[PDB]
RNA sequence: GUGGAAGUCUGUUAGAGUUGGUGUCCUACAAUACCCUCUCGUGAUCUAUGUGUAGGGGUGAAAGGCCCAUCGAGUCCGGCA
RNA sequence: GUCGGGUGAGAACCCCGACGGCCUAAUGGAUAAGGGUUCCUCAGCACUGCUGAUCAGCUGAGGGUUAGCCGGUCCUAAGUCAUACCGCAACUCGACUAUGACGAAAUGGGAAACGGGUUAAUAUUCCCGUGCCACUAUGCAGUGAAAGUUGACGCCCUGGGGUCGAUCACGCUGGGCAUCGCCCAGUCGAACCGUCCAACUCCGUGGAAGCCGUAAUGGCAGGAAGCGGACGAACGGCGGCAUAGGGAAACGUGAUUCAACCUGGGGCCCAUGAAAAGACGAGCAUAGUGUCCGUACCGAGAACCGACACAGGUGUCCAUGGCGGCGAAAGCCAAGGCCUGUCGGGAGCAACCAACGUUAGGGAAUUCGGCAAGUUAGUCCCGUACCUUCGGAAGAAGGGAUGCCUGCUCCGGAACGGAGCAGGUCGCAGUGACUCGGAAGCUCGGACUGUCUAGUAACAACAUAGGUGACCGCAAAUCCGCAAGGACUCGUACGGUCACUGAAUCCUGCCCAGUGCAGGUAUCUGAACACCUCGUACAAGAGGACGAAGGACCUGUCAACGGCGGGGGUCUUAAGGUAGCGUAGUACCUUGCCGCAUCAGUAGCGGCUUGCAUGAAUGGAUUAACCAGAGCUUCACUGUCCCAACGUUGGGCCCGGUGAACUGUACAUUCCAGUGCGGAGUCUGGAGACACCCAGGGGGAAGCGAAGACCCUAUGGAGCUUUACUGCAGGCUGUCGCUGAGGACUCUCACUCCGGGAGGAGGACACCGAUAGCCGGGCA
RNA sequence: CGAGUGGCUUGCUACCUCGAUGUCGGUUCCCUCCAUCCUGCCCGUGCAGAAGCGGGCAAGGGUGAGGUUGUUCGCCUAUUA
RNA sequence: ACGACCGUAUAGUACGAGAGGAACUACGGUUGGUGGCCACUGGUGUACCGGUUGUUCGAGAGAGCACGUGCCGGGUAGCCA
RNA sequence: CCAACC
């Protein structure tokens, strides 16, 4: 996690980096199916290694609270 | 690093060269403008009244 | 004294210019005669240097290959539509008039056909509220109610890359890299830390502005610094 | 155990720099040099060439620093005896 | 460097040999810029050369640079210019928009050349051998031809293929050494043509419900392994090239580790890592054409820049030569280069100085201060506190081990790789040289890496992430231009402009009276044009009515400038200092008082604290980590000291040669007193004093060097400030023109904006010209 | 209260020096003064002695090491004739 | 070119109720200063002899280099305290 | 003490 930051920057700064990157690298359910093989390819870009589905999402998560809203309305 | 002698060693750039128009080594090969006769800047020849005393 | 940094900026010298020769493309909506008979397929998702957000390359029916301001949830293979009769789905563009009320939109045109001006930044969106035959009411990201011509085109959904702002830069070096992709001079030296000759706040034994910071709107350039025409300051009240 | 992150550590690798000696020099080797010690050395890093910004103007992580040994306003000639 | 010798009229320094040394990322090899003939030969020594000179980068005279395939030339990059258009009083000026051109010689892209021979000096250029590319012609084949591919690309980790080099094993050829049998060198051979293909991707078969696979991640019924197949690599292997070339000769064979080069897998980005010409796609024979420019040499402790043959500065590649060791480290040594970081001779060679070695006992007593010097040191094993943001602190600390020889064990395919065991054994000392941390505690500051005063400041200053406030919906906010126009901006509030504070953590009190900003405003005040009255046959002018912004007045606002006292159990002027911290990097008093520590402590640390004159983003407190930052203490150690000595190298001294500068009113062998514009070698009185020369450390010449940087004076200069004087940009606002029709309104036709266009939005407004009022250190 | 001497402090003056006489403390090295701290020789005593206290001659010699502080001075410690 | 001090004998004496406690003189030593000298002790001693690390000369022998001794041990003369 | 101005 933020252990690469050593004893620098302080709690918060490297506390959020940990979580953000933690929820960032988890196995995500692919939209083009339901597999947990989605990985980030860069800022806001995700791809499912299973079916090769490359798509747009949040900067650190594949879906955002606002993105999940579009669906509804 | 001193601005004097040690900084003089880095000078190996060619800027002013012999001008095709006037023959003076004043044609800036980077600007392609002669600082002596104005070649590359003006068709007219570079001239100024301050190149001599006012009443002469 | 000497011109302040804000004044050096305006001359548009290299130091203050944006790395335009490195920018990818102008994400303006397509121009359709009419009919909406224009559809394309998302051929790829790319990184947009100028916005730190992703953009999508689309191949349209008539052979036109162009980058588009992508909303969240768009992927390769997906089909997008642009026109009056376009379908009401994420990633599709059509005039506000055709958009159902209560639908989040992005890259909204200011004047019909301008290509899009509003809500284009990471994870943002305008909210189409009211319809009409003469005026479409949109709620922009800043919370402002904007009256627009119903003929103003827009894209359904929110902009991709949301949350970008939720993570701290942590290091000066990270700010550094981002700044190198913008038309901005960075880092920032405080006015109070300069010599009197360089800024209204410069000079003095210890650092401190030797004057109130709230400056008048009518102040000339060179003097308009600090808190410009502030209606108020602080957190109190 | 694997893995190999890091404006991460050691390091006269290259390279960059310069804390102290208030050493040597001070009609100098040198109009900013020499030696030892010392700091940085995967990054906001260092570096070559090309290119751009010009004088009340630039450029400045700001020291009134720098803009050809010259800067609290360059240099040249002129105003000017 | 030395001994011999060569040449010469002349030899320490020109040449030969020997012996002795120096340089190893350079003192060697190839080059970029830049220089410009410095290159080669012959003949010279008046000039230049730190002495000499027969020598030379010097002087005289000649000579030398050879290209289809190495650069240029071609392409486009940041960006530049030209023309058109527009602005400007105007232009050699100026932004945009079109078009054209320009813009890369090591080091961006790019059609094609290798090996050897030759010259005093060139050489992938000439010559020999072999090969290749493009275009054009002719002939055969071909109808395909443009879709696609390539040119074409970041950072970090890593697998596989693989050449050179190096090393190991054995053979062959030659050399060296002379108790042994060792040691060294060589053992060669290109472009190109042909051929081979790992990886990746894909296809067939197959049928895994737990197997397949990696250094690691991973893969699969949406089809795993296995089997077969398509496509498909090296500057690589293999064959030719080659009874080519090269070598005195032999003219090897295998292996390991493997730079180059080839090809894959993984990870990172609030960062996304060029473009274009060109090439491929798209066969072959023979022939012809391939012009133009560059080509020497230096590339640096003498060919460049620095006035110099300057200890400075100056890019690239040789990053794989041997031992060593972790190593592109030290040290030693090859290939190669040099004795030119170019004056010599002499004295046991004194004083004194620069570098440096060794010092008994004491051990920081020295000093502002351990400044300087030293101590420690590599690697392995054991062991490691407070505190902490749980990362760290940490190599904490502290303790032990370390060579050689003989024979072995373990890991691994193996190394000329690594980890151990047993026995034997030497020294004062086994990281034996070299390389190579001294350690600990308390406090202050700044969180951290980072920045800076080229040339006296590296810090606590600047930056920073983080916190905060302000402006702005884009025909915007902010900013540049006289204008035409422009930056921000291929940007759009998760934006970016303007400011303040300065990581995290816990917090951030009271004050809106003054000043600033902003909002509102019945009434008051408030300019010009038009309008009305008076005046004038007109005009000047006087007065009136209307009244915009602005001000009065009201309100909001302190993470806005800033403020938080005196008196009494309110007063000025709004409030009257809260949490914290506190004798502070702020406390004058002050060496405050108590304690700690010391023989003794104006220091330091802890506590108290009425704070001359602490205090909350003018941020307060606190704080792990970090630091060439400030202060204090301890252990260790030591010539810092007691108290100095001896030694080493280079100078100093004498000799040959070369050969400056600073300074100079005059006189001048002075000393003690006095006098004098009161600080005299020179005046007065005495004293002393034979001349000259060498060495010395510097008492005096108010020594030399610089028309005092302090201070004052001048109706001197400049930079800076502001509620100084006076003005000028600029912004807001009214009015007039642009400007049209029917104190409130509709319309469309100018004009503006959006749109490719149709058309849409707006609209007599806005923009622009003129003028009036307000603000106006932004500027003079 | 009165009379003086010195020229270490401080003040006063503006005579010398602004085409410069480098500034505190310390250090090192040399000479000197006496208004004597010790040492020699004396006088007095509220001088038994021992020792103090005060005074006279006297400048030959000596007057040291350390803790805080840049400090001078001073405060402090152990030695000392 | 010598200054000063301590100690012993005088003497537990003179003096004094006691407590306490001298001197003349004769001696031994210390300290500061001074001049000289090296038998003794100590330092140095890149004369010299030895041990030994890396590397090179093939090993051996014998040597160079590692800053003007690579490092370590001993140390004659001389010079010194 | 003192090394200028406060
Ligand atoms: Cl940002
Ligand atoms: Cl070339
Ligand atoms: Cl792999
Ligand atoms: K003076
Ligand atoms: Mg766009
Ligand atoms: Mg930039
Ligand atoms: Mg700042
Ligand atoms: Mg400053
Ligand atoms: Mg300043
Ligand atoms: Mg100012
Ligand atoms: Mg450059
Ligand atoms: Mg040659
Ligand atoms: Mg030389
Ligand atoms: Mg000693
Ligand atoms: Mg002392
Ligand atoms: Mg030191
Ligand atoms: Mg094994
Ligand atoms: Mg302090
Ligand atoms: Mg810091
Ligand atoms: Mg400096
Ligand atoms: Mg520093
Ligand atoms: Mg900030
Ligand atoms: Mg911020
Ligand atoms: Mg600050
Ligand atoms: Mg700061
Ligand atoms: Mg204290
Ligand atoms: Mg506050
Ligand atoms: Mg401040
Ligand atoms: Mg003067
Ligand atoms: Mg002054
Ligand atoms: Mg002035
Ligand atoms: Mg337009
Ligand atoms: Mg002014
Ligand atoms: Mg006077
Ligand atoms: Mg003088
Ligand atoms: Mg007397
Ligand atoms: Mg005397
Ligand atoms: Na792990
Ligand atoms: Na230094
Ligand atoms: Na100027
Ligand atoms: Na081949
Ligand atoms: Na090696
Ligand atoms: Na010579
Ligand atoms: Na660092
Ligand atoms: Na107020
Ligand atoms: Na305050
Ligand atoms: Na630092
Ligand atoms: Na010494
Ligand atoms: Na003198
Ligand atoms: Na000035
Ligand atoms: Na007197
Ligand atoms: Na002094
Ligand atoms: Na005396
Ligand atoms: Na003292
Ligand atoms: Sr230099
Ligand atoms: Sr250069
Ligand atoms: Sr021109
Ligand atoms: Sr003219
Ligand atoms: Sr646009
Ligand atoms: Sr457009
Ligand atoms: Sr200020
Ligand atoms: Sr408040
Ligand atoms: Sr680092
Ligand atoms: Sr380092
Ligand atoms: Sr210094
Ligand atoms: Sr030194
Ligand atoms: Sr100097
Ligand atoms: Sr590394
Ligand atoms: Sr300069
Ligand atoms: Sr003049
Ligand atoms: Sr001659
Ligand atoms: Sr020559
Ligand atoms: Sr060109
Ligand atoms: Sr090239
Ligand atoms: Sr790189
Ligand atoms: Sr390999
Ligand atoms: Sr050549
Ligand atoms: Sr060379
Ligand atoms: Sr050099
Ligand atoms: Sr050699
Ligand atoms: Sr010479
Ligand atoms: Sr010795
Ligand atoms: Sr000390
Ligand atoms: Sr001391
Ligand atoms: Sr140890
Ligand atoms: Sr702080
Ligand atoms: Sr610098
Ligand atoms: Sr410095
Ligand atoms: Sr904070
Ligand atoms: Sr107010
Ligand atoms: Sr209080
Ligand atoms: Sr006389
Ligand atoms: Sr002298
Ligand atoms: Sr004078
Ligand atoms: Sr007397
Ligand atoms: Sr006495
Ligand atoms: Sr005092
Ligand atoms: Sr006695
Ligand atoms: Sr008794
Ligand atoms: Sr030696
Ligand atoms: Sr050692």
Swiss-Prot record, chain B:
Binding note for cofactor: Binds 1 zinc ion per subunit.
Keyword Lipid metabolism: no
Domain of life of the source: Archaea
Polar residues composition bias: residue spans: 1-16
GO process terms (BP): translation
Residue ranges, annotated region (Disordered): 1-25
InterPro entries in the record: Ribosomal_eL37 (IPR001569), Ribosomal_eL37/eL43 (IPR011331), Ribosomal_eL37_CS (IPR018267), Ribosomal_zn-bd (IPR011332)
Signal sequence bounds: none
Zinc fingers (C4-type), renumbered ranges: 19-37
Gene Ontology annotations for the cellular component aspect, listed alphabetically: cytosolic large ribosomal subunit
Cofactor: Zn(2+)
Protein residues bound to Zn(2+): 19, 22, 34, 37
Gene Ontology molecular function, alphabetical: rRNA binding; structural constituent of ribosome; zinc ion binding
HAMAP family: Ribosomal_eL37
Functional summary from the UniProt entry: Binds to the 23S rRNA.
Subunit field text: Part of the 50S ribosomal subunit. Interacts weakly with protein L4.
Protein name: Large ribosomal subunit protein eL37
Lineage, highest ranks first: Archaea, Methanobacteriati, Methanobacteriota, Stenosarchaea group, Halobacteria
Swiss-Prot record, chain C:
One term of GO molecular function: structural constituent of ribosome
Region (Disordered): 199-237
Single GO biological process annotation from the record: cytoplasmic translation
GO cellular component term, pick one: cytosolic large ribosomal subunit
Record flagged with keyword RNA-binding: yes
Protein function: One of the primary rRNA binding proteins. Required for association of the 30S and 50S subunits to form the 70S ribosome, for tRNA binding and peptide bond formation. It has been suggested to have peptidyltransferase activity; this is somewhat controversial. Makes several contacts with the 16S rRNA in the 70S ribosome.
Name of the molecule in the record: Large ribosomal subunit protein uL2
């Amino acid at each position: 996690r933020s252990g690469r930051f050593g004893a620098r920057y302080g709690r918060v700064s490297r506390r959020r980096v940990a979580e953000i990157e933690s929820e960032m690298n988890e196995d995500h359910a692919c939209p083009n199916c339901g597999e947990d093989r989605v990985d980030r390819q860069g800022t806001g870009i995700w791809q499912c290694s299973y079916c090769d589905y490359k798509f747009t999402g949040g900067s650190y998560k594949p879906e955002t609270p606002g993105g999940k809203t579009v669906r509804r309305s | 690093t001193g601005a004097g002698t040690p900084s003089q060693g880095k000078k190996n750039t060619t800027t002013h060269t012999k001008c095709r128009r006037c023959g003076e080594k004043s044609y800036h090969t980077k600007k392609k403008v002669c600082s002596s006769c104005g070649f590359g800047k003006s068709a007219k020849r570079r001239d100024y009244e301050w190149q001599s005393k006012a009443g002469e | 004294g000497r011109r302040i940094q804000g004044q050096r900026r305006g001359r548009g010298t290299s130091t203050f210019r944006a790395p335009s020769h490195r920018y990818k493309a102008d994400l303006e909506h397509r121009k359709v005669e009419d009919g909406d008979v224009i559809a394309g397929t998302v051929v790829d998702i790319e990184h947009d240097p100028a916005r730190s957000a992703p953009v999508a390359a689309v191949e349209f029916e008539d052979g036109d290959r162009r980058l588009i301001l992508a909303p969240e949830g768009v992927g390769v293979g997906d089909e997008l539509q642009v026109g009056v009769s376009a379908e009401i789905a994420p990633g599709n563009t059509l005039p506000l008039a055709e958009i159902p009320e209560g639908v989040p939109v992005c890259n909204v045109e200011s004047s019909p056909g301008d290509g899009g001006k509003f809500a284009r930044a990471s994870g943002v969106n305008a909210q189409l509220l009211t319809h009409d035959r003469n005026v479409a009411v949109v709620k922009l990201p800043s919370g402002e109610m904007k009256r627009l011509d119903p003929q103003c085109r827009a894209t359904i959904g929110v902009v991709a890359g949301g949350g970008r702002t939720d993570k701290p830069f942590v290091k000066a070096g990270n700010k550094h890299h981002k700044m190198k992709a913008r038309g901005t001079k960075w880092p920032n030296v405080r006015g109070v830390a300069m010599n009197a000759v360089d800024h209204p706040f410069g000079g003095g034994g210890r650092q401190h502005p030797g004057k109130p910071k709230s400056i008048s709107r009518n102040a000339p350039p060179g003097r308009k610094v600090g808190d410009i025409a502030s209606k108020r300051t602080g957190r109190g009240g």
